[PDB]
Structure formats: structure tokens, C-alpha cells
Amino acid sequence: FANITNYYTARSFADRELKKSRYSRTLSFSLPYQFIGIEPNDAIAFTYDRYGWDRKYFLVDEVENSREGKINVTLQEYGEDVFINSGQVDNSGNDIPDISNNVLPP
Amino acid sequence: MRLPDPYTNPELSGLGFESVNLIDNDPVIRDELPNGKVNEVKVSAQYWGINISYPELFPDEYSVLDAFILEYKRTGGYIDVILPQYEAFRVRGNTNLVNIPAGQKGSNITMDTQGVLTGIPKPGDLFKLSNHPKVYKITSFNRSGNSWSINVYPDLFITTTGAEKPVFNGILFRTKLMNGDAFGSTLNNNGTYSGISLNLRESL
Known part of the structure; x- marks a missing residue:
């Protein structure tokens, strides 16, 4: 992480990335024009009985508009638990002071 | 610049169309x-x-x-066409006295006939606006005394300026020859030409 320095924040974010990585599924289909106005990172609940899916939760990940109006989309699965962190523990015991380039006094 | 025909040239009756085919093209995606x-x-x-x-x-x-045909090709003009099956004079009067209000648009026209016209249009009549070459077709008609209204297909290609006048009679299509880029006539040893046909598409 290039831009993060609060250790606890970095850990809490890495936990997100790990949990997310369990949800591999990606799904693609096409929509009629009335669903216009969709964007990436809109939240879809998908329902389809044959697969047993029931408000199965997805984020919109790619979109393509057309002159006719037909919309193609792709969804990426996520769970809710992606966004929840565990507890953590105080890391203050290892604040190593990297002093160098100094000469001890008499 | 009419396509010559028996009415223009009764002596040359062979020029009477053997049969004619009228096609609507309504490009649509579905x-x-x-x-x-x-x-x-x-x-x-x-x-x-x-x-x-x-x-x-x-x-x-x-x-x-x-x-x-060669005069048409040289000049690059238009071909005017009459279509006999619609040649009926069921509406007549001082067409140029009618007032069409400006700003009519979309598929409905209303007119003040001022009580001038006599007779009525019928569904399937041709109809044209005096200042524009388009040919429309009557779907439906109504009266309220001197006021008339007609619903017309296709949709209007222009907004009314208020200078337009209706034209119920003598409508000619304005067209050009999409077949014309490879035109030519067989000559048989009978001394008679054969195999001529024309494909026309209106153009504005």
C-alpha cells in the first residue's frame, strides 16, 4: 500500500481484500432500455429460481450503452461480510526508532 | 418532367405500365x-x-x-410520376383559399376549409402539402362543419409555417432511378427492344 500509513487501517483494509477474494463469480447478460441509468458499482439483487438464487447480491462492474438502447452488463459477486472487520490488538509494542548516523557522547 | 405515358402520348400505348408495385419501406429495429x-x-x-x-x-x-432517360441523367434532375389508381377527383374547390395554422407537427392536421371545399377525402387517398414534395396517405378524416382534421401516415417531415396549402389532386411522386447505374436494352432480331424495367425510390 503506497499511500496508507496507519497500521490498523492497513490491516482492516487487507482483511477486506482477503474476504473479497473468496467471491470469484462473474456474470454477464443484457438488459432492455427501461433499465437505463445504471453505472458501475450499482448494487443489484438477482433472483432466479432454477439456480436457487434469491436476492443474490452483486455489484455492476462493466457497462456498454448503445444507440438502440440495449444494455449489456456484467456483475461481480460480493457478500455483506466483505465490509466488516474483526477486532484487532494494540500494536504499540514495536515502535522501533531507527536512529543512525550519530556518535555517542562521552 | 413526367415519365411519358398514354395520357401524355396516347399514340405510344406500349408505354402503359404492364403492372406496378408500390412498396412502403419503414426501416425499424425490433x-x-x-x-x-x-x-x-x-x-x-x-x-x-x-x-x-x-x-x-x-x-x-x-x-x-x-x-x-438520358435527359434526366445529363441534367441530374428528378423523375415525376403519376399513379393512375388514385386518379379520382372526389375533392375540389379553391384549395388556395384554405388556411392551415402554423406550428402543426406530428401526424394530425387540422384545417379551416372556410366552407369552401366540396366533397370529402377517403381513407387511402393520397395527400400532399403544396410546398413540399412528400406524398402522404390518409388514415382517417373528420368534420366539425368547416373545420376538418385528418390523421396522416407517415409522420410529417416538416413543421407547418402557415404558408402551406393542401393538395388533393394531381399528386406526382418525385423520384430517381436507383437501377440506373447499369441500365441498358436488349435488341432482338424482331426489331424490338425487350427486358426493360425500372426501380424507383422517392427522393426529396
């Missing part, structure tokens, strides 16, 4: 939905296509045809 809905979207103009066929032709009437 799909069928798995729930059994049909959905369709319209863009681009409707246009009339016409196909004409001729019998065997003698050299004189043929030469008159070629003398026309």
Missing part, C-alpha cells in the same frame, strides 16, 4: 423478449419504392423513352 413482449424503435425516414415493368417495345416509343 426484438422479441422472452416474456413475449415485442419492442421496436424507429429511426430514419419511411420511403416509397415503385417497380415498373414494360412489354416488348417498338423502336419509336423506345427512342422516346431513351430521349427522356
Whole structure:
């Protein structure tokens, strides 16, 4: 992480990335024009009985508009638990002071 | 610049169309939905296509045809066409006294006939606006005394300025020859030309 320095924040974010990585599924289909106005990172609940899916939760990940109006989309699965962190523990015991380039006094 | 015909040239009766085919072209994009809905979207103009066929032709009437077609090609003008099946004068009067209000648009026209006209249009009549070459077709008509209204297909290609006048009679299509880029006539040893046909598409 290039831009993060609060250790606890970095850990809490890495936990997100790990949990997310369990949800591999990606799904693609096409929509009629009335669903216009969709964007990436809109939240879809998908329902389809044959697969047993029931408000199965997805984020919109790619979109393509057309002159006719037909919309193609792709969804990426996520769970809710992606966004929840565990507890953590105080890391203050290892604040190593990297002093160098100094000469001890008499 | 009429396509010559028996009415213009009764002596050359062979020029009477053997049969004519009128086609509507209404380009549209359409799909069928798995729930059994049909959905369709319209863009681009409707246009009339016409196909004409001729019998065997003698050299004189043929030469008159070629003398026309080459004049058209040289000038780059338009071909005017009459269509006899619609030649009925069921509406007449001082057409140029009618007032059409400005700003009518879309598919309904209303007119003040001022009590001038006599007779009525019928569904399937042709109809035209005096300042524009388009040909429309009457779907429906109504009266309220001097006021008339007509619903017309296709949709209007212009907004009314208020200078327009209706034209119920003598409507000619204005067209050009999409077949014309490879035109030519067989000559048989009978001394008679054969195999002529024309494909026309209106143009504005």
C-alpha cells in the first residue's frame, strides 16, 4: 500500500481484500432500455429460481450503452461480510526508532 | 418532367405500365423478449419504392423513352410520376383559399376549409402539402362543419409555417432511378427492344 500509513487501517483494509477474494463469480447478460441509468458499482439483487438464487447480491462492474438502447452488463459477486472487520490488538509494542548516523557522547 | 405515358402520348400505348408495385419501406429495429413482449424503435425516414415493368417495345416509343432517360441523367434532375389508381377527383374547390395554422407537427392536421371545399377525402387517398414534395396517405378524416382534421401516415417531415396549402389532386411522386447505374436494352432480331424495367425510390 503506497499511500496508507496507519497500521490498523492497513490491516482492516487487507482483511477486506482477503474476504473479497473468496467471491470469484462473474456474470454477464443484457438488459432492455427501461433499465437505463445504471453505472458501475450499482448494487443489484438477482433472483432466479432454477439456480436457487434469491436476492443474490452483486455489484455492476462493466457497462456498454448503445444507440438502440440495449444494455449489456456484467456483475461481480460480493457478500455483506466483505465490509466488516474483526477486532484487532494494540500494536504499540514495536515502535522501533531507527536512529543512525550519530556518535555517542562521552 | 413526367415519365411519358398514354395520357401524355396516347399514340405510344406500349408505354402503359404492364403492372406496378408500390412498396412502403419503414426501416425499424425490433426484438422479441422472452416474456413475449415485442419492442421496436424507429429511426430514419419511411420511403416509397415503385417497380415498373414494360412489354416488348417498338423502336419509336423506345427512342422516346431513351430521349427522356438520358435527359434526366445529363441534367441530374428528378423523375415525376403519376399513379393512375388514385386518379379520382372526389375533392375540389379553391384549395388556395384554405388556411392551415402554423406550428402543426406530428401526424394530425387540422384545417379551416372556410366552407369552401366540396366533397370529402377517403381513407387511402393520397395527400400532399403544396410546398413540399412528400406524398402522404390518409388514415382517417373528420368534420366539425368547416373545420376538418385528418390523421396522416407517415409522420410529417416538416413543421407547418402557415404558408402551406393542401393538395388533393394531381399528386406526382418525385423520384430517381436507383437501377440506373447499369441500365441498358436488349435488341432482338424482331426489331424490338425487350427486358426493360425500372426501380424507383422517392427522393426529396
